[PDB]
Structure formats: C-alpha cells, structure tokens
C-alpha cells in the first residue's frame, strides 16, 4: 500500500488540485465517476453496476413477498 502510495503521490495531489479547482474538494464523486467511465469503457458492465448498487446503498437481501411471488409463479415445492 505505501509503495503504490509513494508511486502515486503526485497523482493524489494532482487530482486533489483538480478536485479543489473543479468542484471544490469533491474527490469522492469525481474519482467514483472516473472509475465508472473507465470500467464501462472496459465493456464489462456487470462489475460496474454491481459497484453502483453497492455504493448507492442498494440492499442485497429482498422482501419475503417477492420470494412468495417467484415461488408461486415457478410452481416449486417447499423442499426444493
């Protein structure tokens, strides 16, 4: 960690300057949208919207009623 920090200290202070001069100390959303634009130009968007759902705060688990809905609609027994 400290090795790549030493390798990228210029980068950290550079986009630090750019964050203060563009949106005024807004490193989080700028660096986030940089990750999103890069990994969507990567054309592997499953990881991208996975990161979007996890950093927005989308819940992993779901409602019981939706489980009931999919169980009824697929006609599955309680054992399976």
């Amino acid at each position: 960690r400290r090795a790549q920090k030493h390798r990228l200290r210029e980068l950290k202070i550079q986009v630090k300057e750019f964050a203060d001069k563009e949106e005024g100390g807004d490193v989080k959303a700028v660096c986030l949208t940089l990750f999103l634009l890069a990994l969507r130009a990567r054309n592997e968007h499953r990881q991208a919207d996975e990161l979007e759902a996890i950093m927005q705060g989308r819940g992993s688990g779901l409602q019981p009623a939706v489980c009931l809905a999919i169980r009824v609609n697929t006609f599955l027994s309680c054992s399976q």
Binding site: E23, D26, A29, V30, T33
Partner: peptide, 6 residues
C-alpha cells in the same frame, strides 16, 4: 451534483 449528471 456529479451523480445527477449522465
């Protein structure tokens, strides 16, 4: 904010 942008 930036999140509001496309």
């Amino acid at each position: 904010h930036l999140l509001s942008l496309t």
